[PDB]
Enzyme design. Structure first.
Site, mmCIF file in Angstrom:
data_model
loop_
_atom_site.group_PDB
_atom_site.id
_atom_site.type_symbol
_atom_site.label_atom_id
_atom_site.label_comp_id
_atom_site.label_asym_id
_atom_site.label_seq_id
_atom_site.Cartn_x
_atom_site.Cartn_y
_atom_site.Cartn_z
ATOM 1 N N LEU A 267 0.738 -1.560 0.108
ATOM 2 C CA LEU A 267 0.005 -0.118 -0.099
ATOM 3 C C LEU A 267 1.037 1.283 0.346
ATOM 4 O O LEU A 267 1.031 2.034 -0.429
ATOM 5 C CB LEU A 267 -0.947 -0.416 0.870
ATOM 6 C CG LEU A 267 -1.758 -0.678 1.326
ATOM 7 C CD1 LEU A 267 -2.986 -1.277 2.922
ATOM 8 C CD2 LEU A 267 -2.834 -1.067 0.367
ATOM 9 N N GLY A 268 1.821 0.829 0.096
ATOM 10 C CA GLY A 268 2.880 1.818 0.244
ATOM 11 C C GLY A 268 4.427 2.189 1.118
ATOM 12 O O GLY A 268 4.997 1.015 1.764
ATOM 13 N N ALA A 269 4.839 2.996 0.312
ATOM 14 C CA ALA A 269 6.612 2.666 0.738
ATOM 15 C C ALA A 269 7.058 3.982 0.852
ATOM 16 O O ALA A 269 6.960 4.738 -0.078
ATOM 17 C CB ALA A 269 7.433 1.566 -0.300
ATOM 18 N N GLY A 270 8.112 3.902 1.787
ATOM 19 C CA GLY A 270 8.894 4.689 1.990
ATOM 20 C C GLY A 270 10.549 4.659 2.418
ATOM 21 O O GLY A 270 10.764 4.192 2.376
ATOM 22 N N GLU B 106 7.853 0.082 4.989
ATOM 23 C CA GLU B 106 6.943 -0.576 3.525
ATOM 24 C C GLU B 106 5.156 -0.757 4.537
ATOM 25 O O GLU B 106 5.599 -1.054 5.779
ATOM 26 C CB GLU B 106 7.355 -1.630 2.851
ATOM 27 C CG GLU B 106 7.975 -1.405 1.875
ATOM 28 C CD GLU B 106 8.586 -2.172 0.678
ATOM 29 O OE1 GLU B 106 8.220 -3.908 1.254
ATOM 30 O OE2 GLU B 106 8.902 -1.865 -0.443
ATOM 31 N N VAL B 107 4.648 -0.565 4.112
ATOM 32 C CA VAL B 107 3.434 -1.012 4.484
ATOM 33 C C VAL B 107 1.660 -1.924 3.275
ATOM 34 O O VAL B 107 2.419 -1.230 2.889
ATOM 35 C CB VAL B 107 2.326 0.564 4.660
ATOM 36 C CG1 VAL B 107 0.560 0.015 5.432
ATOM 37 C CG2 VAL B 107 2.861 1.372 5.707
ATOM 38 N N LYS C 85 2.812 -2.768 9.053
ATOM 39 C CA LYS C 85 4.034 -1.924 8.674
ATOM 40 C C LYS C 85 5.295 -2.515 8.724
ATOM 41 O O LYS C 85 5.316 -3.700 10.025
ATOM 42 C CB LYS C 85 3.796 -0.339 9.359
ATOM 43 C CG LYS C 85 5.405 0.506 9.125
ATOM 44 C CD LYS C 85 4.759 1.847 9.468
ATOM 45 C CE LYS C 85 4.095 2.220 11.176
ATOM 46 N NZ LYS C 85 4.024 3.848 11.257
ATOM 47 N N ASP D 287 0.478 14.629 15.801
ATOM 48 C CA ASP D 287 0.208 14.751 13.945
ATOM 49 C C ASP D 287 -1.535 14.690 13.477
ATOM 50 O O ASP D 287 -1.348 13.654 12.611
ATOM 51 C CB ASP D 287 0.991 13.356 13.793
ATOM 52 C CG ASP D 287 1.552 13.450 12.593
ATOM 53 O OD1 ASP D 287 1.639 14.147 11.692
ATOM 54 O OD2 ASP D 287 2.459 12.419 11.854
HETATM 55 C C1 LIG Z 1 -1.369 3.046 3.600
HETATM 56 C C2 LIG Z 1 -0.854 4.280 4.880
HETATM 57 S S1 LIG Z 1 -1.461 2.870 6.133
HETATM 58 C C3 LIG Z 1 -3.507 2.356 5.338
HETATM 59 N N1 LIG Z 1 -3.555 2.602 4.207
HETATM 60 C C4 LIG Z 1 -5.268 1.265 4.508
HETATM 61 C C5 LIG Z 1 -5.335 1.719 2.281
HETATM 62 C C6 LIG Z 1 -6.536 1.204 1.921
HETATM 63 C C7 LIG Z 1 -6.966 1.206 1.010
HETATM 64 C C8 LIG Z 1 -6.401 2.376 -0.209
HETATM 65 O O1 LIG Z 1 -6.330 2.218 -1.155
HETATM 66 C C9 LIG Z 1 -6.195 3.189 -2.426
HETATM 67 C C10 LIG Z 1 -4.762 3.279 0.581
HETATM 68 O O2 LIG Z 1 -3.794 3.316 -0.473
HETATM 69 C C11 LIG Z 1 -2.447 3.140 -1.167
HETATM 70 C C12 LIG Z 1 -4.288 2.826 1.602
HETATM 71 C C13 LIG Z 1 -5.097 0.822 4.762
HETATM 72 C C14 LIG Z 1 -4.856 0.533 6.219
HETATM 73 N N2 LIG Z 1 -5.231 0.030 7.644
HETATM 74 C C15 LIG Z 1 -4.417 0.848 8.444
HETATM 75 C C16 LIG Z 1 -3.121 0.859 7.623
HETATM 76 N N3 LIG Z 1 -3.932 1.557 6.312
#
Ligand SMILES: CCSc1nc(-c2ccc(OC)c(OC)c2)cc2nccn12
EC number: 2.7.10.2
Length: 271
Positions: free
Chosen positions: A21-24, A28-29, A43, A134
Protein backbone atom coordinates in the site's frame (compact mmCIF):
# COMPACT_ATOMS: atom_id res chain seq x y z
CA UNK A 1 7.25 -7.82 28.95
CA UNK A 2 9.81 -9.85 26.96
CA UNK A 3 8.87 -11.07 23.48
CA UNK A 4 8.39 -14.68 24.63
CA UNK A 5 5.70 -13.50 27.08
CA UNK A 6 4.21 -10.52 25.19
CA UNK A 7 0.61 -11.29 24.08
CA UNK A 8 1.10 -9.05 21.02
CA UNK A 9 4.04 -11.05 19.60
CA UNK A 10 3.21 -13.41 16.72
CA UNK A 11 5.38 -15.82 14.69
CA UNK A 12 6.20 -14.17 11.33
CA UNK A 13 4.74 -17.29 9.65
CA UNK A 14 1.15 -16.27 10.68
CA UNK A 15 1.40 -13.39 8.19
CA UNK A 16 1.11 -13.23 4.43
CA UNK A 17 1.79 -9.88 2.79
CA UNK A 18 -0.42 -9.54 -0.26
CA UNK A 19 -0.45 -5.98 -1.57
CA UNK A 20 1.97 -3.13 -0.94
CA UNK A 21 0.00 0.00 0.00
CA UNK A 22 3.02 2.26 0.56
CA UNK A 23 6.81 2.51 0.59
CA UNK A 24 8.95 5.24 2.12
CA UNK A 25 12.31 6.10 3.64
CA UNK A 26 11.67 3.96 6.75
CA UNK A 27 9.84 0.94 5.33
CA UNK A 28 6.67 -0.37 3.73
CA UNK A 29 2.99 -0.83 4.55
CA UNK A 30 1.21 -3.86 3.12
CA UNK A 31 -2.29 -5.27 3.13
CA UNK A 32 -2.10 -8.82 4.34
CA UNK A 33 -3.72 -11.75 6.14
CA UNK A 34 -3.17 -13.15 9.62
CA UNK A 35 -3.75 -16.91 9.81
CA UNK A 36 -5.20 -16.95 6.27
CA UNK A 37 -8.53 -15.21 6.93
CA UNK A 38 -8.13 -11.93 8.76
CA UNK A 39 -7.17 -8.86 6.76
CA UNK A 40 -4.57 -6.67 8.47
CA UNK A 41 -2.23 -3.83 7.66
CA UNK A 42 1.50 -4.62 8.20
CA UNK A 43 4.11 -1.90 8.60
CA UNK A 44 7.74 -3.05 8.10
CA UNK A 45 10.96 -1.40 9.20
CA UNK A 46 13.66 -0.86 6.58
CA UNK A 47 16.75 -2.21 8.40
CA UNK A 48 19.15 0.59 9.26
CA UNK A 49 16.71 3.39 8.28
CA UNK A 50 16.04 4.33 11.89
CA UNK A 51 16.31 2.72 15.38
CA UNK A 52 14.21 -0.41 15.97
CA UNK A 53 13.58 0.98 19.47
CA UNK A 54 12.16 4.15 17.96
CA UNK A 55 10.11 2.12 15.46
CA UNK A 56 8.61 -0.11 18.21
CA UNK A 57 7.75 2.73 20.59
CA UNK A 58 4.75 3.39 18.29
CA UNK A 59 3.34 -0.07 18.94
CA UNK A 60 4.06 0.30 22.70
CA UNK A 61 1.98 3.46 22.85
CA UNK A 62 -0.90 1.71 21.00
CA UNK A 63 -0.96 -0.96 23.71
CA UNK A 64 -2.02 1.88 26.11
CA UNK A 65 -4.60 3.53 23.86
CA UNK A 66 -7.31 1.02 22.98
CA UNK A 67 -10.74 2.24 21.84
CA UNK A 68 -13.29 1.70 19.00
CA UNK A 69 -12.35 5.13 17.60
CA UNK A 70 -8.56 4.49 17.39
CA UNK A 71 -6.82 2.15 14.91
CA UNK A 72 -6.13 -0.95 17.02
CA UNK A 73 -2.75 -2.65 17.48
CA UNK A 74 -3.05 -6.16 16.15
CA UNK A 75 0.46 -7.69 16.77
CA UNK A 76 4.25 -7.22 16.54
CA UNK A 77 7.13 -9.26 15.11
CA UNK A 78 10.15 -8.07 17.10
CA UNK A 79 12.96 -9.75 15.09
CA UNK A 80 14.29 -8.24 11.82
CA UNK A 81 12.68 -7.10 9.77
CA UNK A 82 10.37 -5.63 12.48
CA UNK A 83 6.62 -5.52 11.73
CA UNK A 84 3.88 -3.53 13.48
CA UNK A 85 0.59 -5.17 12.50
CA UNK A 86 -2.65 -3.16 12.86
CA UNK A 87 -6.41 -3.00 12.24
CA UNK A 88 -7.03 -2.76 8.48
CA UNK A 89 -9.06 0.24 7.27
CA UNK A 90 -10.57 -0.48 3.90
CA UNK A 91 -11.22 3.07 2.61
CA UNK A 92 -7.71 4.20 3.45
CA UNK A 93 -6.79 7.78 4.36
CA UNK A 94 -9.65 10.30 4.85
CA UNK A 95 -7.71 12.80 2.77
CA UNK A 96 -7.69 10.25 -0.12
CA UNK A 97 -11.21 8.89 0.42
CA UNK A 98 -12.84 12.34 0.22
CA UNK A 99 -11.56 12.65 -3.34
CA UNK A 100 -12.85 9.29 -4.64
CA UNK A 101 -16.32 9.06 -6.40
CA UNK A 102 -17.91 7.75 -3.14
CA UNK A 103 -16.31 10.48 -0.97
CA UNK A 104 -17.36 13.11 -3.53
CA UNK A 105 -21.03 12.14 -3.18
CA UNK A 106 -21.13 12.52 0.68
CA UNK A 107 -23.69 15.00 2.05
CA UNK A 108 -22.69 17.69 4.56
CA UNK A 109 -24.67 15.55 7.07
CA UNK A 110 -22.28 12.60 6.63
CA UNK A 111 -19.26 14.95 6.80
CA UNK A 112 -20.48 16.32 10.15
CA UNK A 113 -21.01 12.72 11.38
CA UNK A 114 -17.41 11.83 10.49
CA UNK A 115 -16.15 15.07 12.14
CA UNK A 116 -17.91 13.91 15.36
CA UNK A 117 -16.46 10.36 15.21
CA UNK A 118 -12.98 11.97 14.96
CA UNK A 119 -13.66 14.28 17.91
CA UNK A 120 -14.93 11.26 19.89
CA UNK A 121 -11.63 9.51 19.30
CA UNK A 122 -9.69 12.59 20.36
CA UNK A 123 -11.92 12.89 23.48
CA UNK A 124 -10.63 9.44 24.56
CA UNK A 125 -7.02 10.49 23.94
CA UNK A 126 -7.69 13.66 25.92
CA UNK A 127 -9.24 11.76 28.85
CA UNK A 128 -6.26 9.29 28.93
CA UNK A 129 -3.73 12.14 29.25
CA UNK A 130 -2.26 11.70 25.78
CA UNK A 131 -1.65 14.11 22.93
CA UNK A 132 -1.44 13.12 19.26
CA UNK A 133 0.58 16.01 17.70
CA UNK A 134 0.03 14.73 14.07
CA UNK A 135 -3.73 15.21 13.77
CA UNK A 136 -4.83 15.81 10.19
CA UNK A 137 -7.00 14.12 7.52
CA UNK A 138 -4.03 12.02 6.27
CA UNK A 139 -3.93 10.50 9.77
CA UNK A 140 -7.62 9.59 10.02
CA UNK A 141 -8.48 6.20 8.41
CA UNK A 142 -11.94 5.15 7.04
CA UNK A 143 -13.58 1.75 7.32
CA UNK A 144 -15.74 -0.09 4.77
CA UNK A 145 -18.85 1.12 6.77
CA UNK A 146 -17.73 4.75 6.44
CA UNK A 147 -16.68 5.19 10.01
CA UNK A 148 -13.47 7.00 11.06
CA UNK A 149 -10.52 6.22 13.34
CA UNK A 150 -7.44 8.09 14.61
CA UNK A 151 -4.17 6.59 13.33
CA UNK A 152 -0.40 7.14 13.26
CA UNK A 153 0.61 7.35 16.88
CA UNK A 154 4.36 7.82 16.12
CA UNK A 155 4.36 11.34 17.63
CA UNK A 156 1.76 10.63 20.37
CA UNK A 157 2.95 11.20 23.96
CA UNK A 158 1.67 10.59 27.50
CA UNK A 159 1.50 13.88 29.36
CA UNK A 160 2.03 13.90 33.16
CA UNK A 161 2.55 17.69 33.69
CA UNK A 162 0.11 19.03 31.06
CA UNK A 163 2.96 19.85 28.65
CA UNK A 164 5.30 18.06 26.22
CA UNK A 165 8.29 20.13 25.08
CA UNK A 166 10.07 19.11 21.83
CA UNK A 167 13.68 19.95 20.89
CA UNK A 168 15.11 23.23 19.45
CA UNK A 169 15.60 21.66 16.01
CA UNK A 170 12.28 19.76 15.77
CA UNK A 171 10.09 20.67 12.74
CA UNK A 172 6.30 20.29 12.39
CA UNK A 173 3.95 21.10 9.48
CA UNK A 174 3.19 24.78 9.71
CA UNK A 175 -0.41 24.74 8.41
CA UNK A 176 -1.69 22.10 10.85
CA UNK A 177 0.30 22.94 13.99
CA UNK A 178 -0.75 25.33 16.79
CA UNK A 179 1.40 28.53 16.97
CA UNK A 180 2.74 27.71 20.48
CA UNK A 181 3.98 24.34 19.29
CA UNK A 182 5.68 25.90 16.26
CA UNK A 183 7.13 28.80 18.29
CA UNK A 184 8.18 27.19 21.60
CA UNK A 185 8.01 23.44 20.88
CA UNK A 186 5.31 23.17 23.57
CA UNK A 187 2.40 20.76 22.87
CA UNK A 188 -0.78 20.08 24.88
CA UNK A 189 -4.22 18.61 24.12
CA UNK A 190 -5.16 22.20 23.11
CA UNK A 191 -2.51 22.04 20.32
CA UNK A 192 -4.40 19.02 19.05
CA UNK A 193 -7.61 21.06 19.32
CA UNK A 194 -6.13 23.69 16.99
CA UNK A 195 -5.15 20.90 14.55
CA UNK A 196 -8.72 19.53 14.69
CA UNK A 197 -9.95 22.94 13.45
CA UNK A 198 -7.62 22.65 10.41
CA UNK A 199 -8.78 19.04 9.91
CA UNK A 200 -12.37 20.35 9.75
CA UNK A 201 -11.38 22.53 6.76
CA UNK A 202 -10.00 19.43 5.08
CA UNK A 203 -13.28 17.58 5.67
CA UNK A 204 -15.46 20.31 4.23
CA UNK A 205 -13.25 21.00 1.19
CA UNK A 206 -12.86 17.25 0.40
CA UNK A 207 -9.16 17.18 1.29
CA UNK A 208 -7.86 20.44 -0.11
CA UNK A 209 -4.72 22.05 1.38
CA UNK A 210 -5.41 24.56 4.23
CA UNK A 211 -4.88 28.27 3.67
CA UNK A 212 -5.55 28.09 -0.12
CA UNK A 213 -2.82 29.91 -2.00
CA UNK A 214 -0.61 30.82 0.93
CA UNK A 215 2.99 29.96 1.74
CA UNK A 216 4.02 29.08 5.29
CA UNK A 217 5.40 32.58 6.04
CA UNK A 218 2.17 34.18 4.80
CA UNK A 219 0.19 31.89 7.14
CA UNK A 220 2.40 32.75 10.13
CA UNK A 221 2.18 36.42 9.18
CA UNK A 222 -1.64 36.33 8.90
CA UNK A 223 -2.20 34.48 12.19
CA UNK A 224 -0.08 37.03 14.05
CA UNK A 225 -2.29 39.87 12.75
CA UNK A 226 -5.32 38.06 14.23
CA UNK A 227 -6.66 36.67 10.95
CA UNK A 228 -7.65 33.02 10.75
CA UNK A 229 -8.21 30.82 7.69
CA UNK A 230 -10.61 32.38 5.19
CA UNK A 231 -14.07 30.75 5.13
CA UNK A 232 -13.78 27.64 2.93
CA UNK A 233 -16.19 27.51 -0.05
CA UNK A 234 -19.50 25.85 0.96
CA UNK A 235 -18.66 25.72 4.71
CA UNK A 236 -21.71 26.06 6.95
CA UNK A 237 -21.21 29.18 9.09
CA UNK A 238 -21.96 27.04 12.14
CA UNK A 239 -18.99 24.79 11.45
CA UNK A 240 -16.88 27.75 10.52
CA UNK A 241 -17.52 29.27 14.01
CA UNK A 242 -16.61 25.94 15.60
CA UNK A 243 -13.25 26.01 13.71
CA UNK A 244 -12.69 29.58 15.07
CA UNK A 245 -13.19 28.24 18.64
CA UNK A 246 -10.35 25.77 17.89
CA UNK A 247 -8.14 28.62 16.68
CA UNK A 248 -8.41 30.76 19.79
CA UNK A 249 -5.24 32.66 20.63
CA UNK A 250 -4.87 31.25 24.18
CA UNK A 251 -4.65 27.49 24.41
CA UNK A 252 -6.80 27.40 27.54
CA UNK A 253 -9.70 29.22 25.79
CA UNK A 254 -9.93 26.45 23.14
CA UNK A 255 -12.75 23.98 23.83
CA UNK A 256 -12.35 20.39 25.03
CA UNK A 257 -12.68 17.48 22.56
CA UNK A 258 -15.71 16.16 24.43
CA UNK A 259 -17.31 19.55 23.78
CA UNK A 260 -16.39 19.40 20.11
CA UNK A 261 -17.93 15.90 19.86
CA UNK A 262 -21.04 17.10 21.56
CA UNK A 263 -21.50 20.12 19.34
CA UNK A 264 -20.84 18.21 16.13
CA UNK A 265 -23.37 15.49 17.08
CA UNK A 266 -25.94 18.28 17.47
CA UNK A 267 -24.94 19.66 14.06
CA UNK A 268 -25.42 16.17 12.62
CA UNK A 269 -28.83 15.26 14.09
CA UNK A 270 -30.08 18.74 13.06
CA UNK A 271 -29.26 17.98 9.39
C1 LIG B 1 -0.98 3.10 3.38
C2 LIG B 1 -1.25 3.96 4.60
S1 LIG B 1 -1.74 2.95 5.96
C3 LIG B 1 -3.19 2.16 5.53
N1 LIG B 1 -3.71 2.29 4.29
C4 LIG B 1 -4.84 1.64 3.92
C5 LIG B 1 -5.35 1.81 2.54
C6 LIG B 1 -6.54 1.20 2.12
C7 LIG B 1 -6.99 1.37 0.80
C8 LIG B 1 -6.27 2.13 -0.12
O1 LIG B 1 -6.75 2.30 -1.41
C9 LIG B 1 -6.14 3.14 -2.39
C10 LIG B 1 -4.97 2.75 0.34
O2 LIG B 1 -4.19 3.53 -0.48
C11 LIG B 1 -2.88 3.14 -0.88
C12 LIG B 1 -4.58 2.56 1.66
C13 LIG B 1 -5.49 0.83 4.84
C14 LIG B 1 -4.94 0.73 6.09
N2 LIG B 1 -5.31 0.05 7.20
C15 LIG B 1 -4.43 0.28 8.22
C16 LIG B 1 -3.33 1.18 7.74
N3 LIG B 1 -3.82 1.39 6.40
Amino acid sequence: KPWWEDEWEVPRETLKLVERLGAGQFGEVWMGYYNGHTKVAVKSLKQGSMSPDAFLAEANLMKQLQHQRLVRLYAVVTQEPIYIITEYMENGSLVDFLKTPSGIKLTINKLLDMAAQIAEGMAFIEERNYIHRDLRAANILVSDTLSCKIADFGLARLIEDNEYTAREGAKFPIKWTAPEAINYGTFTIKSDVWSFGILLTEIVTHGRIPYPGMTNPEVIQNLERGYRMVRPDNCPEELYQLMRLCWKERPEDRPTFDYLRSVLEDFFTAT
